[PDB]
């Protein structure tokens, strides 16, 4: 294969990227986007703050741009995300009880319906759990509605879109641990009670040289519950600046991640959280860390590229 798109296509899997629609006007960005991936997800355009800035006032221009790009270039479209405690507008945080629940349900229905038939899979609920196990302790949904908001969101999404693959996503759940265990129980419960749920998305925002050794085993146990699994936001951050050794370790890590997916029949694929280090979200969020993607700031392929190609 000459591109990662061809590599993934040949393996019967998806290799996607998180898109910022504004960057499509940047030639090199568009070129890589068009030729190296077969799946796209909106990095921010489909989130609550971008789609419902004011209650009952939806703004789909940006999300539409991402959707159109996917259809126009023949790429699968992944939706991110309907219910998330972050990037949730204040107007929503100011609501409580029935009023808040009604806003959540309507947000889910309106957004899922708007992209119905275009978005093939949704991260319906994102980051519901806490590192160490249990529910997240700073979520407006967890605090205002309690444990049952997750099931409500999934049922509401299914009602609005009867065929879309409905997923629950989280980070720090790639290996078997307290957090992934809580998520595992949730998945098993939902399947047992017939609650709509078709997939689990493992963000996979990892640290260089720290890929869980039981990643594949963990992916397989979830898949064995009767759902598909997918790596949704892969990036492997290192201490900046980067150097030969760090980039080498990173490449080996990318290979291990893609391999784990290849080793599980139900792993739909791997989506990296961006194309270039130039725009990666890491530096601004993790001071002193970065150089997490496959292309560097000059759009030059890093060693990770060859590793992903080989892994597929």
Ligand X SMILES: O[C@@H]1[C@@H](O)[C@H](O[C@@H]2CNC[C@H](O)[C@H]2O)OC[C@H]1O
281 binds ligand X (CB under 6 A): yes
Cβ proximity to ligand X: between 38 and 81 the closer is 81
Angle, CA 202 vertex, CA 17 and CA 43 arms, to 5°:
35
- Is 127 an active-site residue? yes
Shortest Å distance, C-beta 275 to ligand X? 12
Q: Tokens 């991640």 label which residue? A: 257
- State how far Cα 72 lies from the chain centre: 21
Residues touching ligand X, count (CB under 6 A): 7
Shortest Å distance, C-beta 45 to ligand X? 10
Please, what is the angle between helix 97-114 and helix 149-160, to 10°?
A: 30
Q: Catalytic residue among 26, 233, 289, 310, which?
A: 233
Shortest Å distance, C-beta 86 to ligand X? 7
- Is 233 an active-site residue? yes
Dig out the tokens for 45 from the structure: 């355009």
Interface residue with ligand X, options 121, 126, 152, 172 (CB under 6 A): 126
Q: Catalytic residue among 116, 127, 174, 289, which?
A: 127
C-alpha distances (whole Å) from 10 to each of 4, 45, 59, 203 are 10, 30, 37, 24
Residues 43-102 that bind ligand X (CB under 6 A): 43-44, 81
Neighbours of 275 (CB within 10 A): 24
Cβ proximity to ligand X: between 268 and 309 the closer is 268
Cβ proximity to ligand X: between 154 and 312 the closer is 154
Residues 227-246 that bind ligand X (CB under 6 A): 233
Shortest Å distance, C-beta 85 to ligand X? 10
| Closest residue by Cα to residue 232 from 117, 85, 78 | 78
Interface residue with ligand X, options 142, 172, 203, 218 (CB under 6 A): 203
Cβ proximity to ligand X: between 126 and 139 the closer is 126
Residue nearest to ligand X (CB): 281
268 binds ligand X (CB under 6 A): no
Beta-carbon contacts of residue 15 (< 8 Å; ≥ 6 apart):
4, 5, 7, 8, 36, 37, 38, 39, 269, 270, 271, 272, 308, 312
220-233 in b/e burial notation, b at 16+ Cβ within 10 A? bbbbebebbbbbbb
CA atoms within 13 A on the CB side of 78: 32
Shortest Å distance, C-beta 43 to ligand X? 5
190 binds ligand X (CB under 6 A): no
Shortest Å distance, C-beta 223 to ligand X? 21
Q: Which residues are catalytic?
A: 127, 233
Residues in contact with ligand X by CB under 6 A are 43-44, 81, 126, 203, 233, 281
């Amino acid at each position: 294969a000459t591109t990662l798109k061809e590599a993934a296509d040949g393996a019967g899997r998806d290799f996607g990227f998180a898109l910022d629609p504004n960057r499509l006007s940047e030639a090199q960005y568009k070129a890589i986007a068009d030729s190296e991936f077969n799946l796209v997800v909106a990095e921010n355009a489909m989130k609550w703050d971008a789609t419902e800035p004011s209650q009952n006032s939806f703004s789909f221009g940006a999300g539409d741009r991402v959707a159109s790009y996917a259809a126009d270039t023949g790429k699968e479209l992944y939706g991110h995300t309907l219910v998330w405690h972050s990037q949730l507008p204040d107007w929503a945080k100011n609501l409580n009880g029935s009023a808040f629940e009604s806003a959540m349900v309507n947000h889910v229905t309106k957004v899922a319906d708007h992209f119905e038939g275009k978005v093939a899979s949704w991260d319906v609920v994102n980051e519901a759990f806490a590192d160490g196990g249990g529910r997240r302790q700073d979520s407006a949904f967890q605090q205002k509605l309690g444990n049952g908001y997750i099931e409500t969101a999934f049922r509401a999404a299914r009602a609005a879109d009867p065929t879309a693959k409905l997923c629950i996503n989280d980070y720090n759940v790639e290996g078997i641990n307290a957090k992934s265990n809580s998520l595992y129980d949730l998945v098993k419960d939902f399947k047992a009670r017939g609650v709509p749920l078709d997939c689990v998305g493992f963000q996979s925002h990892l640290i260089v040289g720290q890929v869980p050794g039981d990643f594949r085993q963990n992916l397989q146990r979830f898949a064995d519950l009767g759902v598909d699994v997918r790596i949704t936001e892969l990036d492997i951050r290192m201490r900046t600046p980067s150097d030969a050794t760090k980039l080498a370790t990173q490449a080996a890590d990318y290979k291990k991640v893609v391999q784990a997916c290849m080793q599980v029949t139900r792993c739909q694929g791997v989506t990296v959280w961006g194309i270039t280090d130039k725009y990666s979200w890491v530096p601004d969020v993790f001071p002193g860390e970065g150089a997490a993607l496959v292309w560097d700031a000059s759009y030059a392929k890093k060693p990770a590229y060859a590793a992903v190609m080989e892994a597929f």
